[PDB]
Amino acid sequence: DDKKKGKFIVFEGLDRSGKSTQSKLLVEYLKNNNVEVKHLYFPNRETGIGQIISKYLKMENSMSNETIHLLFSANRWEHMNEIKSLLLKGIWVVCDRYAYSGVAYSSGALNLNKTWCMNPDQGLIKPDVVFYLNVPPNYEEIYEKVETQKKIYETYKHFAHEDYWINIDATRKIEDIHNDIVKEVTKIKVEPEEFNFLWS
Numbered sequence: 622d623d624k625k626k627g628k629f630i631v632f633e634g635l636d637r638s639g640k641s642t643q644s645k646l647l648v649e650y651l652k653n654n655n656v657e658v659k660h661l662y663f664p665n666r667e668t669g670i671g672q673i674i675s676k677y678l679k680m681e682n683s684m685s686n687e688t689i690h691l692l693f694s695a696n697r698w699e700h701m702n703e704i705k706s707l708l709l710k711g712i713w714v715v716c717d718r719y720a721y722s723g724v725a726y727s728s729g730a731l732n733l734n735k736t737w738c739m740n741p742d743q744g745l746i747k748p749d750v751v752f753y754l755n756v757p758p759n760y761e762e763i764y765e766k767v768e769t770q771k772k773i774y775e776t777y778k779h780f781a782h783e784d785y786w787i788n789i790d791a792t793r794k795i796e797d798i799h800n801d802i803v804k805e806v807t808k809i810k811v812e813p814e815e816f817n818f819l820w821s
């Protein structure tokens with residue numbers, strides 16, 4: 622009746638870490654293996670909430686640090702019913718960015734308290750695995766600056782030792798990064814299981 626049957630994979634990483642390259646490669650690989658999979662992205666800029674987030678990111682409005690933080694969290698909550706329904710049926714979800722982005726970006730770029738940042742996402746569906754595309758920032762949107770990216774790299778380390786968190790050296794060839802990811806995916810437990818939730 623109520624078991625999670627599909628698998629839920631999140632990609633995390635700084636901007637231009639290769640997330641969408643790798644997530645598209647993973648989705649293609651799963652589809653070639655007959656697995657039904659939905660590719661989702663956060664923020665979803667299409668929703669009423671996402672359209673405001675979009676203005677914020679393009680600097681078409683300005684918003685206070687707590688206001689935008691909470692909108693990013695509400696934007697995930699408005700997808701929970703749909704993600705749950707997919708996973709309950711056995712459809713997999715590959716998702717570019719999630720609650721980890723919310724915490725790392727707001728604490729890193731906006732200097733918000735980590736616990737305060739985590740609280741609104743408590744209760745979101747927990748993914749089976751997070752692939753963190755690790756690219757030290759050594760080299761249009763509000764967080765674009767290399768100075769801003771360096772602060773976020775540090776804050777992402779908050780999650781580095783959780784057993785769901787898989788560090789991926791994203792400085793390697795694209796094919797080799799993808800092979801690395803496919804390998805970890807084959808380790809995911811096959812059978813249905815109870816849903817788990819952040820930040821358990």
Ligand SMILES: Cc1cn([C@H]2C[C@H](O)[C@@H](CNC(=S)Nc3ccc(Cl)c(C(F)(F)F)c3)O2)c(=O)[nH]c1=O
Binds near residue numbers: 678693719727765
């Ligand atoms: C899910 C989520 C995302 N973000 C930020 C992360 C990222 O800095 C920003 C960028 N998002 C998207 S969809 N695209 C994007 C495209 C180009 C460029 Cl240059 C950038 C950025 F400015 F970040 F570099 C971002 O959205 C957040 O700040 N909090 C969140 O919870």
